[model samples]
Target chain A: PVYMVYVSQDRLTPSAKHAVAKAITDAHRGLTGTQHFLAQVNFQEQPAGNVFLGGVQQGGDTIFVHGLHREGRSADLKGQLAQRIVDDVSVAAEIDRKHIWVFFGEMPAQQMVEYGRFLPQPGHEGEWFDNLSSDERAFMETNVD
Target chain B: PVYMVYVSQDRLTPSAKHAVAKAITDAHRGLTGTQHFLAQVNFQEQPAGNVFLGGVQQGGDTIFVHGLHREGRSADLKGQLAQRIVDDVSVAAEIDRKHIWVFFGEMPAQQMVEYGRFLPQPGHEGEWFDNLSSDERAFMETNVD
Candidate 1:
């Protein structure tokens, strides 16, 4: 699985989400098997009066990440993703293309430290095991819908 | 009646509206009979794609307008409307402040042009109004609900 991350100064809105999704999907259209790719979006909302201590302000920052194949890094793919996002998002909103920074990477799975904890499954026991402490497990089990 | 006008490069969300309302209300606090002021917000959705024609382009094309009473155009209030919008919207969406352009001006009523005739109110006799043609009048009446 490839994970693409974006950090923008703009607050999340339905329209903004529409814009991002459109841009990403548009870029994917050129890929040989674009339908196989999975994409996700996330945002961090900040308060208006927060002071920027080091000329580094939350609202003025933008970051972009593109996932390469698990085996290799593709500079071309990274550049393509960056250009598509800059073009698409800028067209949809008042985004400054120059402010966006793009990077390429793969998902790290070894970071998944916890393993073997029973979790709820549709019809199988021990099918959804999670590696969590007793307290964490209790909290999760209690919060289950 | 005192009227306020707000403009943006794109359509604003509910949060943006709330932010603008709060900022305007706060700025007028403690003024004599400030409740009389009427505030109105308007959002303009710009076109997609690069807004370039010849050497001119729509880069940094965002503009904001805040209008107040003619008598209230003091130095402090000159840019108050635009500043408030930029500040509030930026805070709400984590957008970069520099991406927005805020401006303020006195109400410009002379520029108003009536598009059609108003519907006769209660107690007024029905008469043929020339401000609108028959088709226009019928369309307007049908949309009342």
Candidate 2:
């Protein structure tokens, strides 16, 4: 699964970005019981002019958290994930909770590709992780933490 | 609905970005029969060091196009949309079809907020659009196209 964090330029400093990324990773793993390496977080800092709310250019610290995950998670899990993300990211980014919006969306595991291999269905991640080459596993362990 | 195009820095020239954005807009509108102004496209250009595939930093011209739309589109329509996006974006970005991956995800309209208002249920956009203030409608017309 991946969490794409969209924020206006300058809204999140380097440390804040790192903090938010970690928060998302922690939330995903703590809630889903997945390995930390399975959660990818990317911070997209866009130009202020590029953002809009209500059809007008926006200049606030509004953040959009879009999560793309494997399908089959329950609605309750999705809601908890979104809320956890919103709560943690607000504190990590030092923005108001209202300024952060979280949306969870799912694509079937068959439709997703990760680590150069197609993702396995939910609950099949153990075999999928085991199948990665040694080098890939090392990289995941060393860098994904 | 929004199509978030994530690409590596310098992979897409400004013109190419514009072309791909228009192609996405066209594809969404043409496939779903939605209003032209209702589709939003955001191009996220990231530094090369920030991108990874299979757990290692990647340097290829791989693009991840993620679509977040109102829930309830048919599976066939979803398949068509993804294929159309891959085809159009491949040509627009001058990248191989294999380098592009498209994922479609949906959210309940009630869970989405666009234009400072909760998104109306899919197929009820006419009423929602008509409910916008004159100024809001004018801004949508002048800027969204």
Candidate 3:
């Protein structure tokens, strides 16, 4: 399982989410022979005071995306995924590519978990997963934890 | 809308993301009449190269989140949000809260976009959101850019 994390620095808006999701989906289309490609986007608003500290002396929005893949596949996915995301979201928000960034890494299954599952564990069964007894399993076919 | 930004020293793991998200969500839960909270998180990876010249040493996984709301709500959110995020994520990652420093701000929507958009207009779309399509209505749905 690969975890692709994207962070965008902008005021949270409905349109922005749509653009990001579209970009990720589109990127997935180009992936061939890949098992799992998951993309998550994180957005944070910029504070007024610290905007003058770094290269962005005036303080502008910054965007970052991380593409996680199996050990052998990361190199191929990094640049392609990054480019697609940058291209899809830039025009709508008028964002500068310099501020937008992406990173890639090859992670083990031990580091992957769904939204609320908490810790990473082997066999995909942590305390949260273990808590799902037979009755609970029958009640809910999905273990959304 | 209010835009809040934070800069850290390095990239963050999933646990780190959860810690930050939990803190922000908790602070909002404790506050009165606060709702519709939205946030974005950006990690600068290793910041040895991106630091400002002759400025205080600052670089790392920075998290920023912003949204719009009634006035007088910014102060409460800033202090509580920053404190909780540092405290929670630090503990989860087994790092000191001091190492995970934070900063924040409040600004109007236009200003937020002006300062936060990755690619400011009159300049080439740098990297992050450059590929986004201009004509797409879905482009603005997320705060990522």
Candidate 4:
């Protein structure tokens, strides 16, 4: 399943929302290894009062982007991806690079289930994602790290 | 950071929406060790046309309850919790038990950060959650799986 991107609402113009949504989704796909996550990109926009960081309220100056990936990726990989993710969305949403935070939400790959079955088994993603189109599969495998 | 509850907008009544938000959030805190997860929740409601599961479109009967948890939890723990979570929300939100799916978005405990810093340094959640009211902490630490 694709990761959902949650950001604060009322901060972006109507068009920037779509721009950042796609940019960040593509960025996530760019760092991943399959089309398994490409189909479901939910750009979740909520209010300021509801979002936070280190007990500090995340207001308009900040863009909170939430994402998910299969577990087992190294922290080094995630840290680098985080910087690139924020940089990718900042340009699309026109926000300051320092103000954007991309949170990585991990999922146990072996247990990602849907309809009482496994969606993407750990150590066996090729069993499913191999069916994706050539163009989609190219950048996806770049995330093998 | 508190787990954000993302659900379809029209799927539940206004009051039911509130009920499930807390129900699911509490379910999370109940399953985790500390109060690192406070009671922040988001009820993201949108048209069914936008919600998808297994490449199939989702409508009113389906509820997507996405959650984030710190990593290192056993699969057995998350598996049992998924059913319990879906059940908890079903009663509160008046939805079918079979229709709800709780996707666990796990994060590496040591690396989960916010405000450009770690949100909860492992083995130190007591510093924060301990300060919560007894009533709050009671239901929180209840989650041990």
Candidate 5:
């Protein structure tokens, strides 16, 4: 299971939020090859006085993505995922790449209970795929758990 | 410059959001002793279908917090900050302590900009602090920063 929460100073039009959400889901599916595991993606647009950058106030302009997933991805992969995020966000928001930043928080399988049970840890994730249908298996196996 | 983004599956009422946000800022201040560098503390609440635990969907009953900040706090302190979060949240949200999980993601200071300038990394934080006014330095020195 995955959850994505994004915060931006840019007040997005409803249509833009929908477009960005679609692009993000598409990006994740492109990287992982499946969309079943991605359950939620929320976009929050704050008012001008609510944000700041480097000691300076940043209105609704900064694009920040906070991604949550099961732990075990390599450090290098995280960087690449973030790059994809920056690229997609820029295209959808009509902003420069320099304006985007990404942050990730990984959870241990035991700490994350799915459908009421703790999920399998990283090493055991493959077993999870074994029980799923081929199409679903392809989703977890391509990139990350 | 630092951004603190918090996500929780538990839906928050207006007053609860206020109290929890205050406690979070207080906890950080208690640990680092500063509020100047901490410009924003966003508390985002989502719907049930948007959050999953252990592979199962979590409704409004979950207590999960993910915080982003600058890298380099001592190992001893992370646990303390998380514990304080749990304590405050349980009372404010009326949730069980055992149900809460707090996660943190640390960022390198060089990659962060404040007031239009790149911030000095951890080892050089003192140099940057020296340039600030005495009042600001005091904000970062006593209990937390």
Candidate 6:
């Protein structure tokens, strides 16, 4: 799954960025029980005048967190994951709860390609892991804790 | 609605960016019959080492287009919109079709807040527009085509 955190430019300092990333990864893995290393987080900063809320331009007060992952999670689990992200990100970014928007979207594993192969369906992660080439497996082993 | 175009940094020249944005907005409005002004396009450039495909790093090749929209469109319409976007963006971004991935996700309009108010449901856009304050309407008029 890929987690995209979009914020206004200069809104999140370096330390805050790290904290937010850690919070998202921790919550996602802890709550969803996905592999720790499979949580891919990316931060994007939107320049001024690029973001509008309520017909007026907004600056640093807003955050939009979106996740794209394989489908099959239960609604209860999705709700919990979304809420935890909202809570943690709000605190980490110093943004108000209502100002942060968290949206999680899912698709079939076949629709996503990673590591040069289609993503495995839910519960097929181990089989997918086994199929990767030795070099890819080595890469993951080296980078993952 | 927000159409987020994520590409590797330096992959798209400024001209290509404008072309890509225009193509996406046009295809979205033309196919879905949405207001042209409602299409929000954002470009995010990721630095090298930020993107991975099939466990290997990729550069200047992959394009990820994700649209966050209000639910209501039929699956067929969504598929058409997705295919058009894939075709046009591939040409605009000079990337191969296979390297481009497009995903459209929908949520209830109530979950999205724009122009400082909750979005109207699928068929309530007109009423929502009518209820906006003069200042907001003026802002929309000034910037919209």
Each prediction's TM-score versus the true structure: 0.31, 0.61, 0.37, 0.55, 0.52, 0.59
For residues A68-129, could you state the per-residue lDDT of candidate 5 as single tens digits? 66776665665566567667877887766545666666777679874344567555654665
Report, for every candidate in turn, its global Cα lDDT versus the true structure. Answer: 0.38, 0.76, 0.42, 0.60, 0.58, 0.74
Pairs of colliding residues, candidate 2: A54-B115, A115-B54
TM-score ranking, high to low: 2, 6, 4, 5, 3, 1
Which residue pairs collide in model 6, if any? A54-B115, A54-B116, A55-B115, A114-B54, A115-B54, A115-B55, A116-B54
The complex in candidate 1 yields a DockQ of 0.01
DockQ, in order, for the candidates? 0.01, 0.12, 0.03, 0.12, 0.12, 0.10
Q: What lDDT tens digits, residue by residue, belong to model 6 across residues A1-145?
A: 8887888788888999988988898898888776666777798786644443322344566677878888888767776777788788877777666566666668898899765678787788877788778998777676443
Tens digit per residue, CA lDDT, model 4, B4-69: 555666777877876876677677667765442444556667544444332334455556566665
- Over B16-100, each residue of candidate 6 has an lDDT whose tens digit, in order, gives 7767777787787788766655666666777877789889987667888988998998899899999999999888778789999
Candidates' RMSD to native: 22.6, 7.2, 17.5, 8.6, 8.6, 7.5
Against the true structure, candidate 3 reaches a TM-score of: 0.37
Any runs in candidate 4 off by more than 4 Å, and if so which? A1-6, A36-40, A44-59, A114-117, A129-145, B1-4, B14-62, B67-74, B83-101, B105-145
In CAPRI terms, where does candidate 3 land? incorrect
* Candidate 2 residue-wise lDDT at B85: 81
- Candidate 3's DockQ is 0.03
Instruction: Report the C-alpha displacement of residue A124, candidate 5, in angstroms.
Output: 6.7
Q: Best candidate, lDDT-wise?
A: 2
**DockQ class, candidate 1:** incorrect
Q: State the displacement of the C-alpha of residue B96, model 6, in Å, after optimal TM-score superposition.
A: 2.3
Clashing pairs in 4: A33-A140, A106-B106, B9-B45, B9-B46, B30-B143
Clashing pairs in 1: A9-B94, A11-B93, A117-A129, A117-A130, A119-A128
Q: Across residues B1-145, which tens digit of lDDT does each residue of candidate 5 receive?
A: 2335344434666556555555666676677654444434554455567667788976567766676766778867878987887897788767787777778767655334332233455566556767866664554343222
Lowest summed lDDT across 10 adjacent residues in model 2 chain B is found at: B49-58
Give me the overall lDDT of model 1.
0.38
Question: Which residue runs does candidate 1 get wrong by more than 4 Å?
Answer: A1-10, A48-54, A58-69, A107-145, B1-145
Off by over 4 Å in 6: A1-5, A11-43, A46-145
Clashes of each: 5, 2, 49, 5, 21, 7
